[PDB]
UniProtKB/Swiss-Prot annotation:
Coiled coil: none annotated. The chain holds residues 550 to 580 of 591 of the full protein. A zinc finger (CCHC-type) spans 3-20. Binds strongly to viral nucleic acids and promote their aggregation. Also destabilizes the nucleic acids duplexes via highly structured zinc-binding motifs. It is found in: Virion. This is Nucleocapsid protein p14.
């Protein structure tokens, strides 16, 4: 589905589904 992770903004997925290491502002993708 069209859900551009507005958190990391490096892929489409849910925040909780964000499997990225870091996110915007280079934040540590929290659990
Ligand atoms: Zn993400």
């Amino acid at each position: 589905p069209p859900g551009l992770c507005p958190r990391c903004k490096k892929g489409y997925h849910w925040k909780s589904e964000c499997k990225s290491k870091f996110d915007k502002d280079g934040n540590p993708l929290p659990p």
